[PDB]
């Protein structure tokens with residue numbers, strides 16, 4: 001039916017969703033199963049591409065209040081002849097900007113979407129080589145960082161053609177720390193990044209073999225083999241982590257980078273596929289995964305912090321893990337704030353998202369939202385999103401997962 | 413098809429076949445997921461449902477197709493023909509009630525599902541008898557603090573005009589009163605029901621922890637009030653193992669969580685009064701929402717007594733005071749030898765429970781939105797555990813509150 005209702009059980013506020021009617025592709029759920037906690041549940045032909053392009057162009061001309069206009073009809077005819085003759089088409093600059101903002105606006109799992117309209121779009125579709133990709137990525141990092149006053153941005157490289165000429169950033173984020181598995185089984189650096197670290201070493205990277213080695217960019221242009229580049233260290237803003245009360249916390253030697261910039265996702269606009277589209281914002285404190293690091297040869301940060309807090313770690317019901325996790329997250333927010341590097345705590349981010357979601361229900365007719373990903377990884381129920389019912393559905397333009405490029409790349 | 417679920421910490425992959433047996437809907441569609449939405453019989457329809465349940469009962473005792481299986485199917489069929497309903501055998505009631513718990517996708521405590529004490533109250537005819545059955549349930553389940561899981565099942569729905577109902581949401585809850593300004597004396601969750609009890613003749617002590625009276629409805633009659641004997645109500649004063657000032661907050665809670673407003677469905681039959689009880693997970697105990705003074709709740713007051721910076725949210729003072737309150741609850745129950753489980757232990761048990769269920773049953777319906785605890789989610793092992801949610805019967809269902817349906821006599 002046309003209307004779907006969601007309720008906030010703290011405030012009793014009821015919102016009516018009609019935007020779900022524009023949902024495009026399946027969720028994986030059926031009337032008899034829900035896959036809401038499942039992590040994720042050769043190119044387009046001509047006849048596949050015609051309706052996807054028309055739907056995006058219609059949506060674009062509706063958004064600028066020119067629906068059915070002469071320019072709308074002429075744009076549609078242009079796109080159709082272009083697909084008819086070249087099996088693909090090119091977006092105008094305005095449509096590219098529109099589509100990237102709306103892929104962020106449509107990202108159900110993103111709590112930071114109140115900012116969606118302020119995204120800075122860098123058009124890199126004239127790029128032809130990995131050196132040019134490096135240039136574009138350096139400028140993006142410099143612009144987005146802005147000496148700590150972080151600005152959201154995306155850089156969009158050429159779209160996919162036949163599938164054998166893809167542009168790809170092999171990094172999962174533009175800035176991440178290396179991880180090195182030792183022979184004795186322990187891990188030095190970030191354990192999340194051991195596989196990609198091994199790939200870089202294999203491609204020729206000389207690793208410093210420290211705890212916080214910024215990984216090199218591994219960049220692939222036009223389907224060619226990827227090439228390694230070192231980001232200039234002055235472009236990488238970092239924050240040492242200290243605690244406002246625990247003078248010993250700085251002795252852990254922890255730091256983190258300021259700029260979260262995800263680079264392994266695919267951007268889909270009007271049936272066109274931008275397989276290289278790194279996008280960046282600023283952190284929510286809880287995301288910063290400094291928790292997983294190893295302080296010594298056995299204990300991770302959560303254990304090491306609790307040990308220095310003199311907590312009882314023999315019983316789980318002493319809640320020493322919860323107590324230590326709070327102090328770690330206090331330290332993260334204090335350090336970014338003291339250094340004037342943009343960051344948002346989870347109470348502020350979730351209060352903003354509720355305001356955002358309400359505005360979207362009124363002005364747009366709904367807001368696709370993935371509760372499983374929107375609720376913060378700690379203190380869930382004391383944030384306003386916990387008691388908020390949400391509807392999840394897939395609108396396009398969208399950001400999508402894609403397989404890792406080392407699994408598919410045909411080495412030259 | 414079979415569906416896989418992955419734990420993203422252990423990389424353990426479980427294969428789910430049980431979802432292929434579910435026949436009730438979840439609310440989702442191919443195009444919209446509603447996993448965060450809270451709430452998404454005639455003679456002709458009854459026998460298929462009953463046969464379905466009878467089939468799975470005799471499949472469970474490894475006597476499918478047996479003589480007794482067929483005779484029982486024949487019996488249930490004739491009985492629906494002549495009477496438009498049927499009665500469960502005691503064996504089937506026990507099996508049904510345990511599997512309603514086994515199938516409750518939102519319950520993290522289901523490792524215990526087969527240790528459920530079932531009290532058959534299907535001979536009850538009056539609210540006085542309901543009171544008797546309920547007192548015996550509370551005394552048995554409390555067991556001087558060594559809590560034991562139990563359910564008491566009252567007669568099933570007949571024509572819908574004669575339901576048995578427990579009007580309380582839990583057997584034991586604290587009253588909550590509307591204050592002249594706008595704050596709340598007692599539990600804010602129970603203001604409406606407290607007012608209902610006062611309208612019905614209850615004399616409110618107007619305290620902070622007034623145990624509510626039982627409001628009991630038999631055979632569709634007007635409900636009647638009863639005072640649970642206070643010696644049957646086990647309570648725990650909340651104190652902190654480090655903060656000597658915590659006991660000065662004067663808080664306490666009751667030991668026994670006994671939910672009484674849900675509906676049990678077995679083989680097409682509906683049991684609208686079926687209070688069931690277990691023991692608490694520490695994070696459930698809603699003492700956080702009380703008021704200490706005339707403006708500040710326990711969370712604000714705790715942070716105040718802790719001398720935290722309450723001006724910015726990024727000081728995370730709420731998160732700090734939340735953990736301490738939860739340490740105090742666990743310390744207090746453990747010190748009085750009242751059964752309680754922490755969210756770390758309970759979610760650990762649930763992952764082991766899922767392993768068991770996939771091995772022996774082919775799956776386990778699980779609602780991630782409700783299984784993950786309301787604090788420290790990602791440092792518990794269920795956060796990174798993919799789950800499949802689906803609806804099996806027997807089941808516990810939500811039902812309307814009786815005061816919205818009842819025509820007073």
Ligand code: HEM
Pocket residue numbers: 103104107109110111112113115119152153154279280281282283284287344349373399
């Ligand atoms: C501006 C500040 C931003 C904040 C504070 C923020 C916050 C978040 C958080 C907390 C998550 C979940 C993280 C996790 O579960 O590990 C997330 C996911 C996501 N964000 Fe945002 N975000 C921001 C900006 C952006 C921008 C600029 C884009 C794209 C243009 C974006 C697109 C996404 C997407 C696609 C996901 C989901 C990824 C997936 O499904 O795997 N975000 N965001």
Ligand code: HEM
Pocket residue numbers: 509512513516518519520521522524528561562563688689690691692693696753758782808
């Ligand atoms: C024995 C110890 C038990 C523990 C520790 C436990 C724990 C929990 C928790 C923490 C919740 C969610 C609470 C919330 O969201 O506030 C829950 C839900 C639930 N529990 Fe259990 N439980 C236990 C026993 C039982 C028993 C004995 C039954 C019934 C026979 C049961 C039936 C249910 C049901 C039906 C729900 C979901 C109700 C709904 O759909 O809203 N539980 N349980």
Ligand SMILES: Cc1cc(N)nc2cc(-c3ccc(OC(C)C)c(CN)c3)ccc12
Pocket residue numbers: 260261262264265279280281282283284287
């Ligand atoms: C722009 C931005 C800002 C921010 N503050 N946070 C962000 C987090 C993600 C994100 C989070 C989780 C995730 O999936 C997990 C398996 C790590 C993915 C998939 N690459 C992306 C993506 C973009 C983010």
Ligand SMILES: Cc1cc(N)nc2cc(-c3ccc(OC(C)C)c(CN)c3)ccc12
Pocket residue numbers: 037038039372373374420780795796797798
């Ligand atoms: C149910 C659920 C909810 C949520 N809100 N988030 C989740 C994040 C992960 C997840 C998956 C993979 C992964 O890492 C690599 C294997 C891709 C990480 C990061 N450790 C997290 C898995 C499940 C999640």
Ligand SMILES: Cc1cc(N)nc2cc(-c3ccc(OC(C)C)c(CN)c3)ccc12
Pocket residue numbers: 669670671674688689690691692693696
């Ligand atoms: C036997 C048992 C033990 C326990 N330790 N905990 C339990 C919690 C619920 C429960 C929790 C929430 C809930 O619904 C919320 C919307 C308030 C309902 C049904 N209303 C039941 C039900 C039974 C429980």
Ligand SMILES: Cc1cc(N)nc2cc(-c3ccc(OC(C)C)c(CN)c3)ccc12
Pocket residue numbers: 009386387388389448449450601781782783
């Ligand atoms: C999305 C979600 C997840 C979860 N895990 N839990 C949730 C609990 C409530 C909820 C709703 C009503 C309510 O109160 C009565 C009106 C039933 C209470 C208890 N105060 C909780 C609402 C939403 C929840």
Ligand SMILES: [Zn+2]
Pocket residue numbers: 029033034035036440444445446447
């Ligand atoms: Zn779903």
